[PDB]
Amino acid sequence: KFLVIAGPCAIESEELLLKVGEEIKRLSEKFKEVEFVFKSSFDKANRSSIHSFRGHGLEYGVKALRKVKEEFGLKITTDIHESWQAEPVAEVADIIQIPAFLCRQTDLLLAAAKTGRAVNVKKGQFLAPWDTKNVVEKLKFGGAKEIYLTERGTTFGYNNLVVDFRSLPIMKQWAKVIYDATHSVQLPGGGMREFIFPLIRAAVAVGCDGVFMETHPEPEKALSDASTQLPLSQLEGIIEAILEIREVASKYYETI
Amino acid sequence: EKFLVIAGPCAIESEELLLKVGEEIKRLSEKFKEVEFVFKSSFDKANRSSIHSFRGHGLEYGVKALRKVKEEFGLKITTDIHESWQAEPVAEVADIIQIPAFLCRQTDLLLAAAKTGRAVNVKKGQFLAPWDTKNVVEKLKFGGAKEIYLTERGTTFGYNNLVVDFRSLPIMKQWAKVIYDATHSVQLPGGGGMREFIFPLIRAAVAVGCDGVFMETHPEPEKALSDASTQLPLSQLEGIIEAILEIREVASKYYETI
Amino acid sequence: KFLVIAGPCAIESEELLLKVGEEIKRLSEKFKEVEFVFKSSFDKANRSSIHSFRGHGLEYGVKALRKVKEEFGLKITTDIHESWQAEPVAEVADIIQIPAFLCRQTDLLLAAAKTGRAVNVKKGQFLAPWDTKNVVEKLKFGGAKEIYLTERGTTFGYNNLVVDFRSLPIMKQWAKVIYDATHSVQLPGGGMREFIFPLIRAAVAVGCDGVFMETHPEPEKALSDASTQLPLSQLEGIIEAILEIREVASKYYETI
Amino acid sequence: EKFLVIAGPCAIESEELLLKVGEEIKRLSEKFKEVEFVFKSSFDKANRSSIHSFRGHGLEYGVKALRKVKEEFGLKITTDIHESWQAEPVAEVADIIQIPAFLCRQTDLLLAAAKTGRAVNVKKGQFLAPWDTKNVVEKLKFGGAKEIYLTERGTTFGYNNLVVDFRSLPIMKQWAKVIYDATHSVQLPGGGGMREFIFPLIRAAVAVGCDGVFMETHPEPEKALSDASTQLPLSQLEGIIEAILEIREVASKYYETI
Ligand SMILES: O=C(O)C(=O)C[C@@H](O)[C@@H](O)[C@H](O)[C@H](O)COP(=O)(O)O
Numbered sequence A, C: 001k002f003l004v005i006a007g008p009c010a011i012e013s014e015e016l017l018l019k020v021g022e023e024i025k026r027l028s029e030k031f032k033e034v035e036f037v038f039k040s041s042f043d044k045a046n047r048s049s050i051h052s053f054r055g056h057g058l059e060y061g062v063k064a065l066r067k068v069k070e071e072f073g074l075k076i077t078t079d080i081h082e083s084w085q086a087e088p089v090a091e092v093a094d095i096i097q098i099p100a101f102l103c104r105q106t107d108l109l110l111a112a113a114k115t116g117r118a119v120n121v122k123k124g125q126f127l128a129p130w131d132t133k134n135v136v137e138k139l140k141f142g143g144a145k146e147i148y149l150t151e152r153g154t155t156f157g158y159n160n161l162v163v164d165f166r167s168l169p170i171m172k173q174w175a176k177v178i179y180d181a182t183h184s185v186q187l188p189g190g191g192m193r194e195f196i197f198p199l200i201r202a203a204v205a206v207g208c209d210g211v212f213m214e215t216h217p218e219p220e221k222a223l224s225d226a227s228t229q230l231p232l233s234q235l236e237g238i239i240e241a242i243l244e245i246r247e248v249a250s251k252y253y254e255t256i
Numbered sequence B, D: 001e002k003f004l005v006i007a008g009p010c011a012i013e014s015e016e017l018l019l020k021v022g023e024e025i026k027r028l029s030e031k032f033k034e035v036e037f038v039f040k041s042s043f044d045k046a047n048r049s050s051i052h053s054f055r056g057h058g059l060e061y062g063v064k065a066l067r068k069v070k071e072e073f074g075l076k077i078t079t080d081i082h083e084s085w086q087a088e089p090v091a092e093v094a095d096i097i098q099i100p101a102f103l104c105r106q107t108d109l110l111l112a113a114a115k116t117g118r119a120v121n122v123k124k125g126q127f128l129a130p131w132d133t134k135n136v137v138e139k140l141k142f143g144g145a146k147e148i149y150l151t152e153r154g155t156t157f158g159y160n161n162l163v164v165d166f167r168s169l170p171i172m173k174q175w176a177k178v179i180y181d182a183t184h185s186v187q188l189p190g191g192g193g194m195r196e197f198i199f200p201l202i203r204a205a206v207a208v209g210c211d212g213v214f215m216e217t218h219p220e221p222e223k224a225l226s227d228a229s230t231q232l233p234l235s236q237l238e239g240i241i242e243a244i245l246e247i248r249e250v251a252s253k254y255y256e257t258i
């Protein structure tokens, strides 16, 4: 099934997760041919500023995510930042996410693989698409069976990311490929929200295995990535659009 | 809102090549009635990397060859100019005058094209940010152009590589009609890709939304005298045009206003 | 001799050329081991805006440059924009300059070469350093004997140029290399003036055959490239600095 | 304003390698009394591209080996850490704790280093703009660091290539002491250059102005187990250090304030 990974960027509160989770559950009942996976980070471990929001800790976050899985029967994903975190996170996370800056950290990758969960690696803004073959090879060496690579943009001069859509067919040679619709048009340190939907249309027309998109009931109040979180109320329309474009374009997806 | 398809062989290798490709584009134009086809070929490759590479058979020969395509098949014509004096003779045959990407800031060339009364299509320089095309359009409007296109053809991304930033399409749409160049956007300059990425990125362009696509084609690309690595085999053009019409239709209700 | 190419960006008036030319003459008498070449453009043929200053025409410009050469006995350089301009310009210009955007225009290069003058090609912001070998080959084919390549920065995302100093030793394989201190830190469409002197120190420490630097008595009033023209009064100090650093560093310039 | 030279073999291939290089750096430190030498070697290459590549002999072995260099030669020591728990044991031997470039935004790693009371040297990420190092320094100051360096090691420039934007040196100097990494700045990541550009770009860095240079060195680079293409032969270190002291001296009166 096509994957849709969605949720609020950060675990701002169990309350926020339950509100978002309720809508993701409703959509999962409406779009049965899509596999939904609920995402939220227990820690923003790489904020630019020491004064910015990080979160409420790994214990609180894992608990809140457990509530979402229990209340709604949704699969769960969250990111890890150091190797020791893999095991406790794997108790709740069906997919362990590796942050883009950390895509080359061998121990983090091996720790995630050791848990027996699926692993989704964000492609570093410094990595070339062909450079991801070695990422997959580490994860296979560590025992991983279900592996995703996520396109999230590439450094393009200062304070800008570009999406090179050539990466989608290149990375598909060795893993399932997800397109991150949210952070790919985030300007680090043109934009931004106005480009989210057009580029997710591009990703599906080119061909991918799923889309990653963050959502919040009121984006302007979000504590992380406010400029690019999608309003919750817009998610349904975008998902239906994704599915329609994929239905038509998929006739033309090239083999391997 | 007829979608534009600009297509033809990169260079005017011979009048015979032009008529062979023209016959196919004419056949497609009769099938895809919802498309406006414009036939393209360059009478001069004025910017080749090497002094030893094919340039062409001269302006007079090329205009005559293009005129024969227009006469025989009733197709609109486009070709590129390189210095201001070429605008006048070229406008005798060309419905759309093309401005090469490296020359997109050359004021005199832009004005020369604009005062002919023909449509003008400027290739966006590999050095230019999408928001900086606003002034290119202003120059053309100042010079009398009433029908203006901007063509996305990739941006310098380190050495010998171009990337297509698809954010450029909605940005440039604020000021002109936008064409996606499927051929030169995946060329690696000075020596992906390349051919394997042409069709995926065309699909991206139409899903994002554009007003036309530019695609070069040759019966036998391996033998072409210019851009051999990226010209589409002529037999593949029909299938690609059908795909972009299908993808455009399904994506179109989602295209953002303005 | 080390080359210093300097002058006001645009021929704003014969008056401006004579004021600048007077100082360049004085410096040429003070620094006898340097070859000075006076630069000014008769046309800014590639301005972003239709409303910006271009100049007073080729005839006026060639005349003003002739006045500088006659009054001060200085060598002259100016840029051309279309092939027909090479011959009339060559009447006064010792070095014909090819603009960066036009570095691949075969006819312009051949027209410049045909005049028998030296030719200095600005390296396009799109060109790789190894890509310049073919530029030199065109000029040799057209009869040119004295050929320069000028480093002027490379496209680095949007509205930014970076100087890759690896280009200096690479381009030296096939031509004399000039470093453009002015336009290399011009942001098209960090910066800017504060970086001019530090990067010209880098260029001389790496090793080049000359430096190109634009100057105006009152930069803030200049009609082109105001943000990067050096105040005339600062030129002497920078030249002396160049020469001192070159004297020491040249011990280490690698062969070929 | 003693200039810093950080030098040593990329990886702790063996304690024996360390002592061989250490003996030479000690000899140079006695000649170039105006330089503060800091000996560098990594106990772990934690970010290699391939699972098959050399990583090292473990933290305990590496710290012991570094301690032997400090004991035998009286040299200051630096090494890099990869996860927060390493800061404490490493601070037992390291005068300067190095933060790898990909990890320059990892708040916990920065704080772990800062609270040790050791100096901290952060490699600027290949993704980071020079003005965005201000917040990296703020994090370290918040965490108690009193001696902070920022190291220029190149910026992503298309695929598999780094460029050094020397404007970064005066920009970063606003907030920290600045080191130029002569070795990794010309490495082509994931497979110029390379070695032929090391010395020219060091000359550029000192002419622009910096507070130190970082240079890896191995008696026989061809045989090194990491960064073999860019490690300097040990016999060349003396000549390069003399050149940068000469160029620094002649350039120094021109270094801009602040
Ligand atoms: O959680 C994810 O999926 C991510 O991609 C991580 C992403 O949210 C982070 O890298 C943030 O974008 C980043 O910390 C925000 O940066 P800043 O607003 O602190 O400058």
Ligand SMILES: O=C(O)C(=O)C[C@@H](O)[C@@H](O)[C@H](O)[C@H](O)COP(=O)(O)O
Pocket: B010, B042, B045, B047, B048, B049, B050, B053, B080, B100, B123, B184, B187, B189, B190, B191, B226, B227
């Ligand atoms: O004619 C067009 O539409 C163009 O975009 C011009 C384009 O064909 C040219 O820039 C060629 O790609 C270029 O001269 C070929 O370069 P090279 O093979 O000589 O290195």
Ligand SMILES: O=C(O)C(=O)C[C@@H](O)[C@@H](O)[C@H](O)[C@H](O)COP(=O)(O)O
Pocket: C009, C041, C044, C046, C047, C048, C049, C052, C079, C099, C122, C183, C186, C188, C189, C224, C225
């Ligand atoms: O004359 C030279 O040496 C040059 O390098 C040409 C240079 O002055 C021009 O490219 C200008 O920098 C350019 O027209 C100014 O751009 P803008 O201020 O019109 O956006």
Ligand SMILES: O=C(O)C(=O)C[C@@H](O)[C@@H](O)[C@H](O)[C@H](O)COP(=O)(O)O
Pocket: D010, D042, D045, D047, D048, D049, D050, D053, D080, D100, D123, D184, D187, D189, D190, D191, D226, D227
């Ligand atoms: O130790 C340092 O100072 C560094 O800058 C770390 C540096 O050695 C590493 O990033 C290596 O360059 C990198 O693991 C080598 O990459 P690869 O040869 O495995 O592709």
Ligand SMILES: [Cu+2]
Pocket: A009, A010, A182, A183, A214, A224, A225
């Ligand atoms: Cu986020």
Ligand SMILES: [Cu+2]
Pocket: B010, B011, B183, B184, B216, B226, B227
């Ligand atoms: Cu072509």
Ligand SMILES: [Cu+2]
Pocket: C009, C010, C182, C183, C214, C224, C225
């Ligand atoms: Cu100028």
Ligand SMILES: [Cu+2]
Pocket: D010, D011, D183, D184, D216, D226, D227
């Ligand atoms: Cu190293």
